[PDB]
A paper describes a structure:
The process is initiated by concerted ATP binding to a [name] ring, rapidly followed by initial contact with GroES, and concludes with additional rigid-body movements of the [name] apical domain to form the GroES-domed chamber.
We used an ATPase mutant (D398A) with normal ATP binding but 3% of the wild-type steady-state ATPase activity. ATP-bound rings from [name]-ATP7 complexes are termed Rs (single), and those from [name]-ATP14 Rd (double). For the Rs states, the fitted models reveal three distinct new conformations between the T state (apo [name]) and the GroES-bound state (R-ES), termed Rs1, Rs2, and Rs-open. When the apical domains of the Rs2 state undergo a further elevation and move radially outwards, all the intersubunit contacts between apical domains are broken, producing the R-open state. Although the radial expansion and elevation break the continuous hydrophobic binding surface, the movements place the helix H/I grooves (which face into the cavity in all the preceding states) into an upward-facing orientation (R-open) in line with the GroES mobile loops, allowing GroES to be captured, whereas the stretched substrate protein remains bound to the separated hydrophobic surfaces. To reach the R-ES conformation, the apical domains must twist ∼100° clockwise and complete their elevation.
Author numbering:
A (entry chain G), B (entry chain A), C (entry chain F): 2 to 524
Write the structure that this text describes.
């Protein structure tokens, strides 16, 4: 079953109360003045983390309708999180701001659909304007700063990510592991990364992220593509011994060879993942060799024409870790000696001398980049296990945000980017008055992030907001030092990606909420 | 179990209260001014859809008798929905209007049976009069408009359906799929559609609609009719490999061949559907070939006399999708090359030159139409999964209504058609006064839809109603612009089919409700 | 599920109340004036032990939030206990002191993060300063005193530990067993200890401490490394007879031999642990022989080149007890005669005469130390089983603390060390006022231990504190005699390790607690 059915105003006030409890609990957290949130545990000491996200996860309300409103806006943070891995609190205060004024306009008699249309138009133009302002990333200091800011005042994690990207760039892979010990640790181990993915998706390992991950696995470099089981038999058994995954790098991922791997790892003997030698055609064989040289068992190549059968137990290689993902196959560390690797480099280096053309030159540079690009490993600091798991989360998000920042650039942080955008949209209008109110609702909500940051400092939101709007460009308020200045020069940046995402998800959920004619729930 | 038994007036007031709660919740929704309904979910954010239907599904009342009244009238929307796929809200306000005045007349002492007879007579004549007024559909713009109107202000879905029907007409099949991505998408893939249905009803797949649906299935064109298992063995095994359905298009659906398909797909090996080559006799073989040319493996024909055995692995064909239904067998996309297809066209095109007669000419044109008629695919827009599933529903209904409109035409929308009909019946009378009151009850209820649309706009129902009744023809009120004008010229049309259905189901359930001498329910 | 969510001050007062109940219950206990705590049992008489730890284990509160605060600070004692095995009560009063003033500062409006930073800085410098003051241990009387003090006024246990360490030093192993009878017991049985650990981490026995323990096991000294099963067959069967564990001491722990032991003890026949002959290379064989001479079956050596097969049933040796751990393999008691042992000593003693060099001299001395170093066994006094199990705990902790004291020295007890450290940090400052308050909070809490000890005596904390701070160095208050004096001269010492640990864990948990923006718990 029997349902309770309402109609009219009574659903709106319920929703609003529910989003307010959630947003108010979450938004404090934001702003350096407030610090941490505690999250209760059934056993032992509570968790202390400054996660807006950590706070949101705990919010559930008694009133069924208020709880619905809270769970709905909670979707904002989660989507912003999944998409950018940062800015969930910012997204939550933007949503509350849009929902609050939007529902007030509805109560005033304004058309919900028009309000939503206006909000949408403002967000569409705001995003374009955000792209126009955003400017790209810089060297490791800037990367560290952005990372720190995106991790909420962990400058350590910020530096780590910046250094890791300085080593491998985007190209290498960057990974995060629990720390070997209680320090933030950043080290480049020989990542060779080449562009497959796995085959049968059924190779997916623990990483729910749609990847696979092997630790100290063995690496069969079938250089030729694998003809026979026979050729595999020796390596498959070496991998049969437990804890040693096997990674098959044959000329392409086979039928024959692949089919066997799928069946064997299907029966629990020798878990195993397969990927092609990189590229196509000729370069494929040359690349399959670069992997051999890196993982130490240098297989007599496909280029040579020698087979997997040629490939042997010597052929098998090994690395502390290998991941095969959306990106690639990435081998982290490698048996292959630097001697062999650096020697291989010298070879290809002459190839470029000999090579008549640019094409051969391009193809060679592609190989050196893959084989030398390497990989950067971020170990979250540790001791105790709780703090270690927490810092790991921050490093993960900070990395994600910084990566985005590097691609298309970051914008002034401290909520000033959205304020500059809002001021540029002062003349934006819609098809009618109600749509115009919706536009204004959105532009007003764009000041909320800066205002909450200031409020958390113990300062006056309107005064600081008024002063920032007074200047222009990167002029903003540094909440850490409580001084005005050039946000970029002070190193307070936000990846354009997280700002954009926070705004779009906030407007999206807000738009939905806005129109509720009738509500139905269990009695 | 022990029952509670009432009698007399007390059942009527209960029913009326129950239909009022349901109808009032539903009818707001209707009218552009009101927007969406929210439907609560046990997990996550509520659903926002503007579905009268969505609202009705949630309505259940505490008082057992009131709940009975609500569940009864709820049958109106569901039947109108099943029959026309649109107009459920319109049907619900017509029912409430008829039930309300009808029960009042009963309370006044009027004979229930006569009241029902009068209502029935008015509806019978009204439907005839509705047919007299209705006028047929037009080109893609009109189709888009009607579709939009039938989808409640989704002009996008309206355009899609209109374009899809412009491509294949009625003849081709039109289908709807979840969008590949988050856009309304409309594309014609080579539908060849021929008239069967499936040899065994036990071939129905998941589509509860009594159709079976295969994705990228293999197509055996047994041109000759299939003699042997032997001939099937090769194709059956190719289909044995999983995910590839098999579609058997042999000269007719067999015994021999059919029986095998029924047994094999019965054991989970090679799921499989069979249909005849189209038509009978000679044309059958020629048509079975058109399918071959379309699905790419051109089987040596029955016309030739070559067999299924002649037919091979080359013979097997393939298409992204095939549906076998009430309509036909429809192959969407096809392996068969345009080269082959267009060449086949040229052949038959000369056949028409050579052909002595009209008969041969007709038969040939039938084949080109089937092979060229093609098929239109409507992809509801996507991102996120919720909105995507919703828009898909709207496109489905809009399509259904527009299809009906194209067949026998549409009538002025905005509730004006029923108002014109009602005015034409002002002199209608029955066998007695009570029957006359029933007639008047029905004619009065016919104004309800226009009045509710206006009420939802925030305007005055009586004033607008009075003004529309004042003019005539397609003169009506445009609720979107709040201007009077020619409904047809403004593109506000309703398929005559949904209007007729809404009225008949409303009168039908209303008639039933009207007479309740005694009521029995569980204690 | 549903959660209750609070925010603001209300979490802090709850936490504080919870830590106060726990700390107040625990801190009495500390100080000689108060004696014991009773712990209720479901059956029989209550347990009487003076364990702060015993009291903490029983603390659970009704109010869910207060209980959380109690369980959180309870983590302080447990970690200090795991790390130093003493000073849990001291750690608890330091935590209460830091938490109390820290939360007061927060309520006053001070920045939690800065408060925590200040506390952390003070603790970091305090620990450095603690190292500067600490001074190393001395002969058995001093060891006894420190042990007694660390065991809370069991001078008996103190003497035992001191004597045990005087026998074997650190080098020998010291162990604790339930008393054979109701006395503090203390005896050196021939421990020969060398550094392995176990070949397989699946040899771990009852001892949860990550060790193995065998009673009267048989000792196979495979001097040569074990080639064959054949060689093992005789000894494996002798060990097959039950209750006699087998310890394999072959040239190294094998593959061949090791693999067999893992499989056999895996099937419940002959439980068995394997360890290498000590060292590498040549010295390995010589050392493997020292074990033979000690466990009585002197195996024809690896040095000789004779094999396990050479080794026989005579070869097998036996000892009341053997433990294989983090430290080593340690054989306690031995079949091997003193005749053989002392004779072996004479041999190696001449080796030193002959030996040309220092290297050979060093290697030989290493062997005599291992073979003669011996082992000290501490039997907690007994009758009745309850008291016996209790005294055993005290001896274990006292031993642990005294061992730490011997390594890097002890500091003045009675809480004076922390008071001296605090006075040396009077000018320590941070980045801002809030950080300065945090520093002061920590320095103030450092007086808490001495103040509680005095309070438990029935004296005035402020007066005694004031007087101790008045003097300097090891000047302190002897709570047993209620006289001031030189803490070291009076034998009141604390291992620097327990003092350091108590302070760090107290500050660590206190720091966490301090910042709670919001709290979430089950309804
Ligand atoms: N010194 C500073 N002055 C002003 N604003 C700052 C400063 N440091 C960081 N910020 C801003 O705070 C926001 C990022 O903090 P945080 O990561 O806590 O927010 P969030 O990402 O929304 O919350 P969460 O990380 O839990 O999702 C950004 O807009 C950032 O620019
Ligand atoms: N611009 C307009 N002016 C007047 N009436 C309009 C306008 N647009 C649509 N309508 C009318 O609204 C009705 C269709 O809307 P809707 O689909 O919401 O009603 P419904 O089909 O009864 O509800 P549901 O689709 O949930 O069953 C039609 O009678 C249509 O002509
Ligand atoms: N004669 C004494 N005068 C002053 N203080 C003393 C005296 N004897 C012991 N103490 C002090 O009491 C403390 C050790 O006692 P105790 O072991 O009870 O404390 P605890 O280790 O914190 O509690 P628990 O052992 O249950 O963890 C030390 O700081 C020690 O120096
Ligand atoms: Mg963040
Ligand atoms: Mg409709
Ligand atoms: Mg103690």
């Amino acid at each position: 079953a029997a349902k309770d059915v309402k109609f009219g105003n009574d659903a709106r006030v319920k929703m609003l109360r529910g989003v307010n409890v959630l947003a108010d609990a979450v938004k404090v957290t934001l702003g350096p003045k407030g610090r941490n949130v505690v999250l209760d545990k059934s056993f032992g000491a509570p968790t202390i983390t400054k996660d807006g996200v950590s706070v949101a996860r705990e919010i559930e309300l008694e009133d069924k309708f208020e709880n619905m409103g809270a769970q709905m806006v909670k979707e904002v943070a989660s989507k912003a999180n999944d998409a950018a891995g940062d800015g969930t609190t910012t997204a939550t205060v933007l949503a509350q701001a849009i929902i609050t004024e939007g529902l007030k306009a509805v109560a005033a008699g304004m058309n919900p659909m028009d309000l939503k249309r206006g909000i949408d138009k403002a967000v569409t133009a705001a995003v374009e304007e955000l792209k126009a302002l955003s400017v790209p990333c810089s060297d490791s200091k800037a990367i560290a700063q952005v990372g720190t800011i995106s991790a909420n005042s962990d400058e350590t994690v910020g530096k780590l990510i910046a250094e890791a990207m300085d080593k491998v760039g985007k190209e290498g892979v960057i990974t995060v592991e629990d720390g070997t010990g209680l320090q933030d640790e950043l080290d480049v181990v020989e990542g060779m990364q080449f562009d497959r993915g796995y085959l049968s998706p059924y190779f997916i390992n623990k990483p729910e992220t749609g990847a696979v991950e092997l630790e100290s696995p063995f690496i069969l470099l079938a250089d030729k593509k694998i003809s026979n089981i026979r050729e595999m038999l020796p390596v498959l058994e070496a991998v049969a011994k437990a804890g040693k995954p096997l990674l098959i790098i044959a000329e392409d991922v086979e039928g024959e060879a692949l089919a066997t791997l799928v069946v064997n790892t299907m029966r629990g003997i020798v878990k195993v993942a397969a990927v092609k030698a990189p590229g196509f055609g000729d370069r494929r064989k040359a690349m399959l060799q670069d992997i051999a040289t890196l993982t130490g068992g240098t297989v007599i190549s496909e280029e040579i024409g020698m087979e997997l059968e040629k490939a042997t137990l010597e052929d098998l290689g090994q690395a502390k870790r290998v991941v095969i993902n959306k990106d690639t196959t990435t081998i982290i560390d490698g048996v292959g000696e630097e001697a062999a690797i650096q020697g291989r480099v010298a070879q290809i280096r002459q190839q470029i001398e000999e090579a008549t053309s640019d094409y051969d030159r391009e193809k060679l540079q592609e190989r050196v980049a893959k084989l030398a690009g390497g990989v950067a490993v971020i170990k979250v600091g540790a001791a105790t296990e709780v703090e270690m798991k927490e810092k790991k989360a921050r490093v993960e998000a900070a990395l994600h945000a910084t990566r985005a920042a590097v691609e298309e650039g970051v914008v002034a942080g401290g909520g000033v980017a959205l304020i500059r955008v809002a001021s540029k949209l002062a003349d934006l209008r819609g098809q009618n008055e109600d749509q115009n109110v919706g536009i204004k609702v959105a532009l007003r909500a764009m000041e909320a992030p800066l205002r909450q940051i200031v409020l958390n400092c113990g300062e006056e939101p309107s005064v600081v907001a008024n002063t920032v709007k007074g200047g222009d460009g990167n002029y903003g308020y540094n909440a850490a030092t409580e001084e005005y200045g050039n946000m970029i020069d002070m190193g307070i940046l936000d990846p354009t990606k997280v700002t954009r995402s926070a705004l779009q998800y906030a407007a999206s959920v807000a738009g939905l909420m806005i129109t509720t004619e009738c509500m139905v729930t269990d009695l």
